[PDB]
Amino acid sequence: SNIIKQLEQEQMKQDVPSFRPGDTVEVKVWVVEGSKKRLQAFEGVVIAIRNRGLHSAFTVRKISNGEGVERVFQTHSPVVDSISVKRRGAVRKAKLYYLRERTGKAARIKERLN
Amino acid sequence: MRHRKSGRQLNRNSSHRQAMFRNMAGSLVRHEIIKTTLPKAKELRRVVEPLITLAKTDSVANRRLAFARTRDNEIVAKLFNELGPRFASRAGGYTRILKCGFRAGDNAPMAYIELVDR
Amino acid sequence: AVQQNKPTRSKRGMRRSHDALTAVTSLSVDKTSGEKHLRHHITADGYYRGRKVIAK
Amino acid sequence: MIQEQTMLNVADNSGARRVMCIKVLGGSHRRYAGVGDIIKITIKEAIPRGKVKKGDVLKAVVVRTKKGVRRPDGSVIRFDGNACVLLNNNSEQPIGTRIFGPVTRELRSEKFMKIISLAPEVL
Amino acid sequence: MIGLVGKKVGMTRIFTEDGVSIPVTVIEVEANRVTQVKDLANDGYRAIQVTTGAKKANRVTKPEAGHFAKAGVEAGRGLWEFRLAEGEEFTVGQSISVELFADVKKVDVTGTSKGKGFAGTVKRWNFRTQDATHGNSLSHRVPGSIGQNQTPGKVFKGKKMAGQMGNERVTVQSLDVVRVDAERNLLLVKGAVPGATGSDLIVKPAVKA
RNA sequence: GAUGUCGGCUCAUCACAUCCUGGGGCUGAAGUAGGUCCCAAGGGUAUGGCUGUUCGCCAUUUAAAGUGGUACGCGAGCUGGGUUUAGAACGUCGUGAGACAGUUCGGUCCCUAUCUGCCGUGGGCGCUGGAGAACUGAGGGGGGCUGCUCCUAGUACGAGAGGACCGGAGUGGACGCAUCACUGGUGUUCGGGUUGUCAUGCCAAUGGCACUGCCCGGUAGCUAAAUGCGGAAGAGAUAAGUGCUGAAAGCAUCUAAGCACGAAACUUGCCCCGAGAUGAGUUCUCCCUGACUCCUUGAGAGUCCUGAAGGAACGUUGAAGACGACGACGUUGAUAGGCCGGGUGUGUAAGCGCAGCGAUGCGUUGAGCUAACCGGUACUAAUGAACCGUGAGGCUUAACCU
RNA sequence: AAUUCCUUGUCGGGUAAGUUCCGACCUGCACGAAUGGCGUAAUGAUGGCCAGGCUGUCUCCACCCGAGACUCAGUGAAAUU
RNA sequence: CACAGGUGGUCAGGUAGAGAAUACCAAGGCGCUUGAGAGAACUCGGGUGAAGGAACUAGGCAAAAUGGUGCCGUAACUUC
RNA sequence: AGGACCGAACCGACUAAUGUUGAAAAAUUAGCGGAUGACUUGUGGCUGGGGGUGAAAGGCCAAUCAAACCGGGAGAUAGCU
Numbered sequence A: 001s002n003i004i005k006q007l008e009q010e011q012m013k014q015d016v017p018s019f020r021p022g023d024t025v026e027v028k029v030w031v032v033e034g035s036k037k038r039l040q041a042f043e044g045v046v047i048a049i050r051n052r053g054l055h056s057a058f059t060v061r062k063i064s065n066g067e068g069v070e071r072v073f074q075t076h077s078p079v080v081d082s083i084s085v086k087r088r089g090a091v092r093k094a095k096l097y098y099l100r101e102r103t104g105k106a107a108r109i110k111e112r113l114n
Numbered sequence B: 001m002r003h004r005k006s007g008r009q010l011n012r013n014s015s016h017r018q019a020m021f022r023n024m025a026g027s028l029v030r031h032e033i034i035k036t037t038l039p040k041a042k043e044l045r046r047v048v049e050p051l052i053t054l055a056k057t058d059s060v061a062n063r064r065l066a067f068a069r070t071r072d073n074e075i076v077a078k079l080f081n082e083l084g085p086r087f088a089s090r091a092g093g094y095t096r097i098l099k100c101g102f103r104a105g106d107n108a109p110m111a112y113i114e115l116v117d118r
Numbered sequence C: 001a002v003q004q005n006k007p008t009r010s011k012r013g014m015r016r017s018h019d020a021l022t023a024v025t026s027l028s029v030d031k032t033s034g035e036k037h038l039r040h041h042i043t044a045d046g047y048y049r050g051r052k053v054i055a056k
Numbered sequence D: 001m002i003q004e005q006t007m008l009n010v011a012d013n014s015g016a017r018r019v020m021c022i023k024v025l026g027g028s029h030r031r032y033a034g035v036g037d038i039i040k041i042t043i044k045e046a047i048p049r050g051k052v053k054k055g056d057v058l059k060a061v062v063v064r065t066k067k068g069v070r071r072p073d074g075s076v077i078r079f080d081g082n083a084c085v086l087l088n089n090n091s092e093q094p095i096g097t098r099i100f101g102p103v104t105r106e107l108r109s110e111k112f113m114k115i116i117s118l119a120p121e122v123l
Numbered sequence E: 001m002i003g004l005v006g007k008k009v010g011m012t013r014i015f016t017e018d019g020v021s022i023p024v025t026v027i028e029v030e031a032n033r034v035t036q037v038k039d040l041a042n043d044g045y046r047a048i049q050v051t052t053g054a055k056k057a058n059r060v061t062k063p064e065a066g067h068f069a070k071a072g073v074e075a076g077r078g079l080w081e082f083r084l085a086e087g088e089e090f091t092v093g094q095s096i097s098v099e100l101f102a103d104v105k106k107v108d109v110t111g112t113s114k115g116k117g118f119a120g121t122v123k124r125w126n127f128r129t130q131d132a133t134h135g136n137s138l139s140h141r142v143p144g145s146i147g148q149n150q151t152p153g154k155v156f157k158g159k160k161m162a163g164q165m166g167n168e169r170v171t172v173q174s175l176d177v178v179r180v181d182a183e184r185n186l187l188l189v190k191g192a193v194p195g196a197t198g199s200d201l202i203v204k205p206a207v208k209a
Numbered sequence F: 001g002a003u004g005u006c007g008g009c010u011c012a013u014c015a016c017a018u019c020c021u022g023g024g025g026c027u028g029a030a031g032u033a034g035g036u037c038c039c040a041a042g043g044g045u046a047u048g049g050c051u052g053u054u055c056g057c058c059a060u061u062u063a064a065a066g067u068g069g070u071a072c073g074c075g076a077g078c079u080g081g082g083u084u085u086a087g088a089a090c091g092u093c094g095u096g097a098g099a100c101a102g103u104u105c106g107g108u109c110c111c112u113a114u115c116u117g118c119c120g121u122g123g124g125c126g127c128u129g130g131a132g133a134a135c136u137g138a139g140g141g142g143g144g145c146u147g148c149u150c151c152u153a154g155u156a157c158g159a160g161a162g163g164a165c166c167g168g169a170g171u172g173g174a175c176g177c178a179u180c181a182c183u184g185g186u187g188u189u190c191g192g193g194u195u196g197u198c199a200u201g202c203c204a205a206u207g208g209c210a211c212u213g214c215c216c217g218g219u220a221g222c223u224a225a226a227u228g229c230g231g232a233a234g235a236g237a238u239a240a241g242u243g244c245u246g247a248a249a250g251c252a253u254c255u256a257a258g259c260a261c262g263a264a265a266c267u268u269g270c271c272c273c274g275a276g277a278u279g280a281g282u283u284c285u286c287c288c289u290g291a292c293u294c295c296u297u298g299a300g301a302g303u304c305c306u307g308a309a310g311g312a313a314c315g316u317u318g319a320a321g322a323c324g325a326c327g328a329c330g331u332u333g334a335u336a337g338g339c340c341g342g343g344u345g346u347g348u349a350a351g352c353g354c355a356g357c358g359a360u361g362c363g364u365u366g367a368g369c370u371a372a373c374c375g376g377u378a379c380u381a382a383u384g385a386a387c388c389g390u391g392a393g394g395c396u397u398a399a400c401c402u
Numbered sequence G: 001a002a003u004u005c006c007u008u009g010u011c012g013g014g015u016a017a018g019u020u021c022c023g024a025c026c027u028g029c030a031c032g033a034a035u036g037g038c039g040u041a042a043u044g045a046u047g048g049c050c051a052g053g054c055u056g057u058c059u060c061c062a063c064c065c066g067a068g069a070c071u072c073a074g075u076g077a078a079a080u081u
Numbered sequence H: 001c002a003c004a005g006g007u008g009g010u011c012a013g014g015u016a017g018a019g020a021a022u023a024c025c026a027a028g029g030c031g032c033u034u035g036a037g038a039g040a041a042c043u044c045g046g047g048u049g050a051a052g053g054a055a056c057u058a059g060g061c062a063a064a065a066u067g068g069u070g071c072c073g074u075a076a077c078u079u080c
Numbered sequence I: 001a002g003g004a005c006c007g008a009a010c011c012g013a014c015u016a017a018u019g020u021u022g023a024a025a026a027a028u029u030a031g032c033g034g035a036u037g038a039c040u041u042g043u044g045g046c047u048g049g050g051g052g053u054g055a056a057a058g059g060c061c062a063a064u065c066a067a068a069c070c071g072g073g074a075g076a077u078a079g080c081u
């Protein structure tokens, strides 16, 4: 509906860069621990992107301490302070859900030259 | 519940529905007017009209699309050579439905479906 | 799953009271031919709303 | 969502390797336990000279779940396996002196400041 | 006090500056025109009748058109009544806007919920099904027993069975009001309100409190 | 001339001789925690191991894991493990056929609901002229559970160890209502990958079939594991209990008059239905104010003219729906389909060119296709009509204006 | 124990918890030597128990595809009374 | 019964395949003598499923799962 | 070589669901066992009712079996309904 459309567009971010599944990104997200508010970096492969305007989200998977971690960021959430693409990956899919069974040599995403 | 769902099941499976509507669209193209059950015509609209929209702008890719659907060279040739140029100026609604009583065998509400320039 | 006592013709008629058909309210008259046809249906001879839509 | 008969891995150097939930404490007919919910477990596979032996019945706190927790913004954090850190039945303090793998913000509480302080990373 | 009649535009979220996503429902609470004032002396109870929106000229029937023209207001799409507290007093023709919820923190939203059709017992009353296997026969979702035996030899009133579910008036209470934008005629409540998009909602101030 | 007999599952409903929470008395009640008795049935009242078992034991919880009635509730609702068919064997009994509330393995559980009942849902007529809408509200139903932490407060109490009543927040468990913004599920109507094979003359490209062939994602919708909300506060009359004043009985005494307090029970307060509430209510609004016979002169029958508000019917239909019903729209038109733009989804179409001997890669290209979504657009289909509904609405009395 | 009543004998193993199972003891109600005793590799749509994998069997169901059920037209039963 | 049952022999093509299995097809035969619409509960036959994984139950009943060829490797026990 | 192995035809019938006035007076769907043999099958023949035949269940002997079916004794008898 139009009214909802303006209500979303009033809050949507404008600085969000272009990234694709297979890209390695790092997302610095505000952490409010104690009284002090800082930034924490989460870096990993982007395995899913859901585009719905304000309701857009994306899933980042990393391998921390031998423990795979997935995190679904709401792209326009104020907590998601910033995103930066540390590497362009080239894949023939839109959701890389097969990387869950893969680790190490079998979880390598080829670079995208152009 | 079927809220906001679209498309009629017509007491058939999906493969049979697909093949039946392919055949019905072929017949409607070929004869420019056919007599069907009223819901079958109301569902054949949604299949036939996109074929004409596809035929409006001619290309080898569009020919292969309209042949992947329908699957007849005679039908695709007729589409692109007449029904495209004939409907080039009309923005949809290429078909007209005229309820024509009931069927003798099973009291099925029947309707004619026609091309609007026939 | 079966009756214990036989229902009367009274109760049978009471049940069938809702089975009566309903006559068509009023036929429409085609404007050009004057034929009678069901509303929003083409006439027997192929006319509808003042046009010849189907040959024969 | 850890319920009875759920096999959790062990995220500390306390000796256990696989444990099985046997009870979700904290309420009647309670169904599941999330990150930060105390459960009663039994050790099903332990290392030889570890602190605790196979078969013991003792509590544990869930720290990583495949279902994962939801942040107020709507985000979720999903791990690749369910993990718990053993606690003593009475003291309810961690038994292991190390915690492996990440833990989450859901433990930033007085009861689990040990785990938060000894964790590798807190997400 | 009195409420307003709105339309459920849809449901969105609000990202507060502290990174919290409030799931809000958007209600298009436009102006409500008071078509009638009912008092004790003539009606035995104090209430106002309001209308909202606008209806088709040729589909506003002559009695309804006359009733609106008595008040001198443009024919809205419906008529709703709101009972009055003793202090407040309204007059005919007054256009009440969503600014009425400027200082109201919690509201009650009542509307017709979605119609689930003919809902079985498992859906309607959360009856538990029976073993999908282990020998079960044609009774994987049936209600099971529905009574005792020869005593009482009858099924009690109010028994839970299958039937029509939804499509009935439902009131969700004590919803937090997030934003009251009068310039766009909007009300934003924290949470989900009954009914599907486009339905009519009656939003009153909180009554529990 | 048959009332199916244990246990399990689903579903319950009542009693109070109450398990928890709620209010009290006494205590060999310091405090916490008790013991016991009185009032109280609103709500709640475990998951597993063993066994066919209800039961019991045990593990671990919980505020609690109540006792009973209901054909030891519930097989025209499910099961068939037990016991009671026919097979077989063990121990024992008998010479034997065979037998054993001794065991051990195996063993066809039928019914399309007429009536009552219950859950939904309509049709008819009534409600005293007809119609549209809003509603009052008799009456009925739903809901009523509770913990843990923190403050009060290491305060009262206590030798200390220990550790409050009262009051106030925060946060959960179970349960219920709603919803789909989010996390996801499904998504055989969307996109792609690929195997076998057949076909479209062949290459290329596609289509059929193989459970959607097998998969990979996924739009709308519906959904839960997802997210919001609820249990109340207060008021009235009380129970057990506590009293004030107070005699009968110079005192005494909660009572005999009179006054007060008092619980999750009761009546309300919250939510839903609800004027067939035949006691058929109220308030707005709208519509119809023409003649004429006959008489069985009756609240009579009939003819002509007239059909109103409105309704119904038909059509396009819906986040409404089994069918009815309900809602929207019918060209004074966005009701549905199509079309246009977008979103979304999958993921760089075909054709052509280049590199490679070739599979293949690269360029046009993030292209192509894109269901149910969104914003628009009368292009197609919602036709003039016709049909039902009438023509001022009984009598008596009262009060008014005359 | 296909035998064992009392009895869920007692001890040990397996389980958080094991009336079933395995190994023992012997107090054999009421084993026992061709109406065979004790073992026994292989075999079994054989009985009991345990573990790995796997799963809607279940926590707790949700959605979808078809055939009925539902409406319309034609035909048109039955038990029972 | 124009009944999802029973009935002996003979012929037996193409591709993939060990195959008279199986998948698609030729030659040939057939769409099964009621259909049409809607897309409720519930039943039947199927598909998929978050986290868990026998906690279900009399019992893993049912379903899920394994599944081919070549090579490597293979325990207790044994009548070898 | 083999009463060998895996597995179609062929023979059976272990589990489940359906059905239980069924499509069928014992079947269908999904699995399941044997599948060169104590196999299976066509055709013809033989054995008959206190008798046959039986790798044994009181099984089978024309949808009938602790003694077939048909006719007769026979209108058996019925202290029973």
Ligand SMILES: *C(=O)[C@H](CCSC)NC=O
Pocket: F084
């Ligand atoms: C026993 O009393 C009897 C069962 C014996 S039949 C195997 N029950 C009758 O109701």
Ligand SMILES: [Mg+2]
Pocket: B004, B005, B006
């Ligand atoms: Mg639609």
Ligand SMILES: [Mg+2]
Pocket: B011
């Ligand atoms: Mg049909």
Ligand SMILES: [Mg+2]
Pocket: B015
């Ligand atoms: Mg197919």
Ligand SMILES: [Mg+2]
Pocket: C004
């Ligand atoms: Mg009788």
Ligand SMILES: [Mg+2]
Pocket: C015, C016, C018, C019
């Ligand atoms: Mg009828």
Ligand SMILES: [Mg+2]
Pocket: B001, B003, E114, E115, E116, E117, F320
């Ligand atoms: Mg609906």
Ligand SMILES: [Mg+2]
Pocket: E128, E129
């Ligand atoms: Mg259950």
Ligand SMILES: [Mg+2]
Pocket: E136, E137, E138, E139, E140
């Ligand atoms: Mg079943």
Ligand SMILES: [Mg+2]
Pocket: none
């Ligand atoms: Mg009888």
Ligand SMILES: [Mg+2]
Pocket: none
């Ligand atoms: Mg009592």
Ligand SMILES: [Mg+2]
Pocket: none
């Ligand atoms: Mg009561």
Ligand SMILES: [Mg+2]
Pocket: none
């Ligand atoms: Mg009460």
Ligand SMILES: [Mg+2]
Pocket: none
């Ligand atoms: Mg028990």
Ligand SMILES: [Mg+2]
Pocket: none
């Ligand atoms: Mg077990």
Ligand SMILES: [Mg+2]
Pocket: F051
């Ligand atoms: Mg058992």
